[model samples]
Target: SEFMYFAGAKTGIYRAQTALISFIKQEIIQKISHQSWVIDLGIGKGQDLGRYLDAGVRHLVGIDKDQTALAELVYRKFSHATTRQHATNIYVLHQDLAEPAKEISEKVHQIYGFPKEGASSIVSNLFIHYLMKNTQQVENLAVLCHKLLQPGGMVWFTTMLGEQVLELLHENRIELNEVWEARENEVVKFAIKRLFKEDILQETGQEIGVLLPFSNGDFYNEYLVNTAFLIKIFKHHGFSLVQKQSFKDWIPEFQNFSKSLYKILTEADKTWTSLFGFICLRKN
Candidate 1:
């Protein structure tokens, strides 16, 4: 549990992921087959693996930066329950997963004999905002998505933060101006400077890290990028937007659950989706 960024999330993230899977299947199930392969990026707790298995996807690969971290996840969680029930051939691989790279494609080819027809779908839920900079790493991920997928293969990712999120917030027009202000300004400003070692009020969409002020023992350094910029990055590398959906519309698997903090997310409407900015972007 400690290993998860949201050990706290429990069903929040997973439920949303499952809903995303359902959403994808409704849109593209015609393209997926038993022989089609699926891959998960950042492989957090491998929670999405169960959803993958449930989706009729027979083969799945989990890629993460930490070998020990991913291994412990399978042993503690999915080694039996999810994999065995669904008969999913699970391969947990260790690799640099933030972006596209030659070795990733090569390794998959060696293991699965190359998805000559391209991978069916890629699960990148709650991931891809940590690349820190939208430079070669982010650009390369787009390229990799194109390379990994066959003609009909699709890739999906979460838009953690972007201009649309800000638009939603503005549209809601909260009576409040800023969440962090005044003497709180000094506290947050100091914390921001301490966390980033620089004086920056707003982010520049590149090499920017954010503060998780909602949770206790809050921290900093999660990447934030504009939606337009991210779409451009994806397009330049060979991805065209297939569809976009609000995450709030999909988290219906539960009613009032998760830690006390994220429960408000289930409430729906203004404050919730605006806060999470869970946009599902499907690649062409």
Candidate 2:
């Protein structure tokens, strides 16, 4: 199950997605804000697509590793080519972000046209982690997006930061016994591999040593990065900060979790928000 219905009240992913979508739209209030063409990296399920369309985004193209998912997105959001009057232009590229940058850019050129005229923005939601495998990859991506954008274009994305995992663990330890056994609502078991994970930060990513096993025979892996590295890399690529928002800004919009858990989550704020942060940067 998701954070929705967690408090046993009645909520789902909607609350969180809605807030983030609102934040994303708010970030687009600039000159190119009109007649905008954007790119979505790691477009999971296209859940945020509708909101972007409603926000006056004229066009959006998403890149993903799954063709079936991309096909499904086309089926769902795209109608025949319409214009600034009625419909939106939506596209999908079935490629991995970790692939060669040229391969990825060519596909966009064929559809949305980038690196020539450039795009208004390159945005990702909850997907940068998979490509944040190393310092080099992160720097490469920042440069790629910079190249993918037109002069004065912007880049924005979200990631789960390392400090956030620490905060969650700090709260989890008080209620969760020091054991590996699974409890109904206990979605994670702190691995015994590390007695103190707070000191586990690595140059690339930090392993919090929490194992999340799902009943559907799946595992959830989370890696936390310093995230400040993003600022450094994007700056090196000539992007300056426009604005940044974090999970604490809207995490409490979620509801319907266990009362106890809900209470704790509802109290979360910007104090530890860098744990789940959003940032927007623009080329000047």
Candidate 3:
């Protein structure tokens, strides 16, 4: 069961990561011709940073709370410089978004030697879920981003929407354990076959592993707008929604196990009332 939850989380991460890379290439790079400063919030291992750099972005900054991930980014930066002679303009720092807006802004200034308003773009992937569970923090972070972004700048992010997978589980009455079991099997299978494998299970060496599986009901209340809530949040912060995309079709890919698992997952998804949302917001 633990394994299954891990698998589901990993599958979601994979889909979001691929979508983010494509979005950056098509929407961001294609629209902006010259070099622009890009900030990746909650950037893990600097994968998105590397993608931006490859797309001709010279000024980049990545923020994350995990020191290990930051270390990997540092090593990658130096290693790539030695082998590929890539320009070393990117910076990585550790930060917690829950901090006061002024303090957070000051940290950004300290690292980059400029005010937060200098950033042209801010990007985040699968990170906002942590904030959704804390409304105060979410409001504060939104204000912080607004302060950090320059006029005409934009913020692009992807996160698991509230209740995104609610219908599938409710229709089947599937125990959280069952969903988790299938997810684990999927991850183990992928680790054996895929080019990229996560060592979360091995490294943690715990019986349950890193990602705990549960329904959205565990955290969110009915008052929250689920995935669509981002639209209002962005608007309130003075950003206009430029694009919004739903990728609920990928849910089946995470839930599929066998003939029975595939049927259950697909049926639930087809009948489900909620879906995940990906949004791009632009500041005027």
Question: Candidates' lDDT values, in order?
Answer: 0.54, 0.60, 0.54
**118-226: candidate 2 lDDT, tens digit per residue:** 8878887778777666888787788678767888878777776655555555555623234332322433322311223344445465443344333332334555556
For model 2, the superposed segments whose C-alpha errors exceed 4 Å read: 1-33, 78-86, 112-115, 167-200, 208-218, 251-274
C-alpha lDDT of residue 90 in model 2: 70
Tens-digit per-residue lDDT, 1-284, candidate 3: 35533333323423333342344334444343234677778888876555565556656778888999888887877686432234436777788876787787777877745544668878886676555544566667677778778988888776544443434334444443333222233332111011112222111111111123233223221122244455566678888888766655444443432334344333223332123455678876
- TM-scores for every predicted model: 0.66, 0.69, 0.63
Candidate 1: the clashing residue pairs are: 118-150
Order of candidate numbers by TM-score, starting with the best? 2, 1, 3
Quick one: RMSD of model 2?
A: 7.2
Better of 1 and 3 by TM-score: 1
What does candidate 3 score on TM? 0.63
Question: Any idea what lDDT model 1 has?
Answer: 0.54
Tens-place lDDT per residue, model 1, 25-93, is: 333332344545787778866655445665566777778887777877777553565433446677777
The candidate scoring highest on lDDT is 2
Clashes per model (N, Cα, C within 3 A) = 1, 5, 5
Note the residue pairs that clash in candidate 3: 1-181, 3-184, 4-180, 4-183, 4-184
Give the clashing pairs for model 2: 6-257, 6-258, 7-256, 7-257, 7-258
